[PDB]
Design a protein around this nucleic acid. Sequence first.
RNA 1: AUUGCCGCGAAGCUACCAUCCGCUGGAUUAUGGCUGAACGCCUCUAAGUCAGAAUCCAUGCUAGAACGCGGUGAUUUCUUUGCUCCACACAAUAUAGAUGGAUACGAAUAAGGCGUCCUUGUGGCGUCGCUGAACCAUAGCAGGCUAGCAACGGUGCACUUGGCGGAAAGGCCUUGGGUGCUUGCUGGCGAAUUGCAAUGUCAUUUUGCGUGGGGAUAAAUCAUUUGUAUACGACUUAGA
RNA 2: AAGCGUUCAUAGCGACAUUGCUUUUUGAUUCUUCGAUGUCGGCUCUUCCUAUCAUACCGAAGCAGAAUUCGGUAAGCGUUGGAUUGUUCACCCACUAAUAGGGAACGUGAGCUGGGUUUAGACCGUCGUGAGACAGGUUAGUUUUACCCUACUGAUGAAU
RNA 3: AAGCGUGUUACCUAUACUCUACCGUCAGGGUUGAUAUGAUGCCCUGACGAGUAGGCAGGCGUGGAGGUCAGUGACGAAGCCUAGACCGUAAGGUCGGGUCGAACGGCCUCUAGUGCAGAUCUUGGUGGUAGUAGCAAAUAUUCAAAUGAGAACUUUGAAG
RNA 4: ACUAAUCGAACCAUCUAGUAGCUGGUUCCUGCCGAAGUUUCCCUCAGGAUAGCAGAAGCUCGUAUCAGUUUUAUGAGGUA
RNA 5: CGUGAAAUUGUUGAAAGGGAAGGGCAUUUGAUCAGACAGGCCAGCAUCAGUUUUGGUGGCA
Lengths: 197, 114, 386
Amino acid sequence: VEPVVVIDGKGHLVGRLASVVAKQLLNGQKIVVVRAEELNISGEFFRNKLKYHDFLRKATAFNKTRGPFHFRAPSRIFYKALRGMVSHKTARGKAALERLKVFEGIPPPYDKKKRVVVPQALRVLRLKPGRKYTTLGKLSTSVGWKYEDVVAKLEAKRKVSSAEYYAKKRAFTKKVASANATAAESDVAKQLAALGY
Amino acid sequence: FNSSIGRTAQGKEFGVTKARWPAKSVKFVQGLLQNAAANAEAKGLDATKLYVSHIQVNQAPKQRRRTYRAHGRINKYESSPSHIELVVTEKEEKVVRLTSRQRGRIAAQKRIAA
Amino acid sequence: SHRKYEAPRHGHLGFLPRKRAASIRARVKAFPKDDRSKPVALTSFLGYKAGMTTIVRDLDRPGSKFHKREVVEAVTVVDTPPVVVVGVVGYVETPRGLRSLTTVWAEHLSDEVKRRFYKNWYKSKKKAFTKYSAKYAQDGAGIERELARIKKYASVVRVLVHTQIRKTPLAQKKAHLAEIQLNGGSISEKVDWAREHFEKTVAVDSVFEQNEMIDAIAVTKGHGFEGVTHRWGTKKLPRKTHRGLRKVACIGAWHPAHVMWSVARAGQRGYHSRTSINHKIYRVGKGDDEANGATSFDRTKKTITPMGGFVHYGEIKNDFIMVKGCIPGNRKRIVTLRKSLYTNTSRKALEEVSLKWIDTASKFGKGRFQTPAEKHAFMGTLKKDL
RNA sequence: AUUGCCGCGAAGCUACCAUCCGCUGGAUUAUGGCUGAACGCCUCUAAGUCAGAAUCCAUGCUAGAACGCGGUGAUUUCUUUGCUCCACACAAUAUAGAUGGAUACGAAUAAGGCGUCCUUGUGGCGUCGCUGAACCAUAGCAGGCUAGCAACGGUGCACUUGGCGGAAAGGCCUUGGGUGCUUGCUGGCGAAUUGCAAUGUCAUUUUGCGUGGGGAUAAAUCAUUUGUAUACGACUUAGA
RNA sequence: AAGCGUUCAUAGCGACAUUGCUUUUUGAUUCUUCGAUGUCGGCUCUUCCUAUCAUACCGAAGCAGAAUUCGGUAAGCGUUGGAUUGUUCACCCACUAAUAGGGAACGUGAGCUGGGUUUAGACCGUCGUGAGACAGGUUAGUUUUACCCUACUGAUGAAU
RNA sequence: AAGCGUGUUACCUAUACUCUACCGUCAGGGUUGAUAUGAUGCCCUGACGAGUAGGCAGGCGUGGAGGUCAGUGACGAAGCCUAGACCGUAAGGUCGGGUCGAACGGCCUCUAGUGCAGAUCUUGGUGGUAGUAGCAAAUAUUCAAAUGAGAACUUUGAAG
RNA sequence: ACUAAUCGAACCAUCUAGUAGCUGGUUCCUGCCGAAGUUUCCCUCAGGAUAGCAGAAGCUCGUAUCAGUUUUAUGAGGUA
RNA sequence: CGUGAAAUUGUUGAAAGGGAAGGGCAUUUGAUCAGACAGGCCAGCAUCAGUUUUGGUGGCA
Ligand SMILES: [Mg+2]
Ligand SMILES: [Mg+2]
Ligand SMILES: [Mg+2]
Ligand SMILES: [Mg+2]
Ligand SMILES: [Mg+2]
Ligand SMILES: [Mg+2]
Ligand SMILES: [Mg+2]
Ligand SMILES: [Mg+2]
Ligand SMILES: [Mg+2]
Ligand SMILES: [Mg+2]
Ligand SMILES: [Mg+2]
Ligand SMILES: [Mg+2]
Ligand SMILES: [Mg+2]
Ligand SMILES: [Mg+2]
Ligand SMILES: [Mg+2]
Ligand SMILES: [Mg+2]
Ligand SMILES: [Mg+2]
Ligand SMILES: [Mg+2]
Ligand SMILES: [Mg+2]
Ligand SMILES: [Mg+2]
Ligand SMILES: [Mg+2]
Ligand SMILES: [Mg+2]
Ligand SMILES: [Mg+2]
Ligand SMILES: [Mg+2]
Ligand SMILES: [Mg+2]
Ligand SMILES: [Mg+2]
Ligand SMILES: [Mg+2]
Ligand SMILES: [Mg+2]
Ligand SMILES: [Mg+2]
Ligand SMILES: [Mg+2]
Ligand SMILES: [Mg+2]
Ligand SMILES: [Mg+2]
Ligand SMILES: [Mg+2]
Ligand SMILES: [Mg+2]
Ligand SMILES: [Mg+2]
Ligand SMILES: [Mg+2]
Ligand SMILES: [Mg+2]
Ligand SMILES: [Mg+2]
Ligand SMILES: [Mg+2]
Ligand SMILES: [Mg+2]
Ligand SMILES: [Mg+2]
Ligand SMILES: [Mg+2]
């Protein structure tokens, strides 16, 4: 129902999240995906590193600059998966892909915006317990992504400011809840309770 | 008509790299510019407001020559002449159909606005 | 079928494309890692390549057949007058790379650096930095605010310096402006150092010292369009070869039905950015000193300049770096000398070098005299009128 | 004498025929190990884990996306009165698609949130979830005019106080009073005929044009010139 | 796995059998091309494969050392100079860390060359009455076009 | 599991199946003392519709011929142009507008040198290529004046 | 080899539109029907004749004669 | 030098344009165009008919 939907990419399975977003984009919903570096791929880190190396070796033989581009960043690995689920050579596919933004970490202005999850694509729900899985940050670093440290540092800074905001919100939520509980057992509250509210 | 022309810095002002200095064409055009100017102030037109409103080049019939080729072959060796014409000009200085609902809405807006 | 005789490939595939560099000033693509413990120092220095000459020195290298025995070594002289600090830039870290947050300039800029911002200086109103210099008006509050922003942010701090090209025998008149990373101390110390050094000159002896291994970053000499024989080093085809022999005979197999990017083909040779490394500084000479070309074993009161001047360059009136061997680029070319990216302890490095003699005979011919007085002594008097 | 021939011959070009220079970190393979079950023993393997190849990825080096980006300088009147910002007035232009609100901890999931207390912990106790089926908002000619009661709250709008925010900050939090509304409650008046429905028009983009209110007063290219450049373009210099 | 290996099947081998892989051999086919896809070899030059000759790190040995041999990861990096032959192939000399094997229209002829096959001249031998024949020998015997598109190498450049 | 085996349902969509309409084809019928004059007509009923080579049928178009429309036309025939209009499944037909200048149609019949995208088709015309390849053998031109609209190139002088 | 850019029999014209089992092309629309590459013979094997498959014209009659089917009864066969 | 087609070309106008272009079905947008008031256009509801699709519920074996 939101005009823009911000998905926290942490602990999601890359391909099941990719299909979800591809359907959302084609159906006209603007999507921003944050914390791309925290995306998961099912399977061992070695298996997924071997798969990327197999992807790396395919290039236009006579000119490597006109070939399959191998983007290293986690948000681009997600974007590549989401392409191929979107008919990206069409105008409709271009307009769908223009409804999507994928970021490492959470930059502004999405720091102070609600992040949702896709339970349909969450590893904690989908993947069998004990199954080995990969984190897209360490995969990306192992294949040449340079900015894991700066992303981690900026995310620690954001988490500190966010925890402080949450402490203030929790204090106000406490006060609000106390005032609403006190207002209960009044006449207006009892009439409200008879109506499911 | 510029395939395999050389490149010059004098094409810069026109947003191009391929520009030439066709002296024979320029002489013919400026001859016609002179004539049309003579015609304009013969008609009584003002000089300072004149601008080239129309200039048109057409292929005239070709003049045929021959060029001799290896192994006793003859090829055409043709001129590509021009018809040129130009004009210089002085620079010069709904009922709406509305339905009943639309008319009523317009009336309603007029009685609740001032 | 298979090649039938193995041979290494002609040319290096990592120095591609062999195209003209985007600027005559080669750009420093990596600065030395920053030790916050050491004091604030420049990481590079700007100089102009002057020429080359020979030296004689004793060789301190045990186990060699030439240990403690003299050797003759070619050296490259770079004319390095002091550079003027005229700006500071703060670089924040980003998941997309380093980003310059803001740039703070000095209140006064010289004409040689103001020229660098013009293409048509003689016709211009010379308006550059006129409104910026009014931000120093009352107390420089805006300047101090921008500097404070660099203190707060800016994980990397690079200082803007320009050469004093007017102190060179070059017709250019227009200074070269470059970003030099500033290593040492906190970010705040780097900003304080840069602010303290605005309008100030920094000498080359405060950045480099003798025996230090340094790197040369310069654009190579240009040669225009070159055929594959000399551009790539391929074999000359036999003498009986119809339709030319300075070529590659086969530019590809039938499939792939394309010419490979790795086939040697004619095109631009030279004028490439190059970063050559591990060049040992043999001398850090001062221009305000006769006997630049003198050593402790010579005592001939002569400067570094050859008789008749450095060919196509002129005389060395400024400070200079004498560096072993050859560096990329030609005479008059702006060169950036950068400190070593790594600590080298190869025992070719760390070798203290003591020059016995520096050649200053003419390089405009087969020069046989070091000084005009030595020429007078050998020749005797001549007929040239007094 | 088509460079007449011979010796030398600077400059330029140039030679493993000359000289200089050619970086150091991580992760791995094979393999060898640790801890260790399965299988009361054993076991490099299953879960964990160490070392480790001319391997791989970085550092470094080359190019720099001609539809990736950032910072900074100066930005044309005494020149058919130009440029720029703001405000309001009309025109035109379009819309990958407003139609109450994108409503901010972090981390785990064989665990957590919230609240409470203490001996401030990997604590005691209580409580919750089993979906946002939520919370917030939400009544009034697309929301009018007007009278009061109760409270001193809510919310809008500008003016304003301070603080924080650089990842792409361009937003968040506040202070003070002022000017509105308030459906927290009780009233009085108006609506009609768009005719039994017709999006029945309420949004946000761009560019003009006019008016009135601030603000600033350049360069680039060609031509000439250099040769660190060069097939030509291009490059790199100079010129009141 | 019967045997060889001093004893000992499997260090290294391995009979009798038997299961496969490969498409650089040659056969088999005749699907594409006969209003023509230039034909052997060499030269040049790039890249690919690994069934690894060398170099790295290793496991095993009938591995004391040295030298070797079998095996793993591994194609990152190299893999030569010559006499004779048109040779592919081969063989010898020699250097070497090594002189591994192959592909790419049996890579590569508008890139060359043209020694070979395979036009017409000519000689020989055998064969044929003869004209003539010979995957038998010998000698001589025109190697054409790019300015188009793409690709490649370099070089400009509108629009912000 | 969005993998493998298996089981259950829901659901998606063919020019196929069911129903309806319209077209055509085939078949079987109806209809004359006004069939309320179209009997190769009109109407009823049912079924059917792929198609190279090929067969047949009904039509469309072109040059000329007999007849008719006492047809059209200098107040504009024919021809040509026309992202203007209408009819026909279609071959095609008709109309408007522009250009134009002297003839031409409808219908019933007769007749044929009667319909083109191809034939390395014939003749003629024209492109892209392309302002491209090129205009480089024979040693070599230069200054001034005169002429002239215009002089590297003509003339004269000087010179090499 | 040469005999006018022509030679293992020149050139010009005619016979001559020489013959071709072979190559190429063979010009409007719609409707209905709709194949064969198999039999025999042939100096036959890139071709023909022949039969077959196909269309067209119908005719004699008007639900028969039938039938790429089964059942019942009765034969035959020498493959698994 | 009657008419004066096509190929090809100039100018003007419109439009589209990330390694062709052209085509089919459908619709949006723009431009352009015919006819009719003696019913022409587009719809809404009700009661039916034909063919279907999806619910609720009753009675029996
Ligand atoms: Mg590609
Ligand atoms: Mg959140
Ligand atoms: Mg990289
Ligand atoms: Mg050319
Ligand atoms: Mg000729
Ligand atoms: Mg090989
Ligand atoms: Mg030759
Ligand atoms: Mg040098
Ligand atoms: Mg010299
Ligand atoms: Mg153990
Ligand atoms: Mg680079
Ligand atoms: Mg760029
Ligand atoms: Mg061919
Ligand atoms: Mg292997
Ligand atoms: Mg071949
Ligand atoms: Mg050839
Ligand atoms: Mg070839
Ligand atoms: Mg030969
Ligand atoms: Mg070409
Ligand atoms: Mg060529
Ligand atoms: Mg299943
Ligand atoms: Mg049919
Ligand atoms: Mg006729
Ligand atoms: Mg007419
Ligand atoms: Mg037309
Ligand atoms: Mg007439
Ligand atoms: Mg005919
Ligand atoms: Mg035709
Ligand atoms: Mg045809
Ligand atoms: Mg030319
Ligand atoms: Mg004939
Ligand atoms: Mg049929
Ligand atoms: Mg016979
Ligand atoms: Mg045939
Ligand atoms: Mg039997
Ligand atoms: Mg039998
Ligand atoms: Mg005529
Ligand atoms: Mg005419
Ligand atoms: Mg035309
Ligand atoms: Mg293009
Ligand atoms: Mg289309
Ligand atoms: Mg019904």
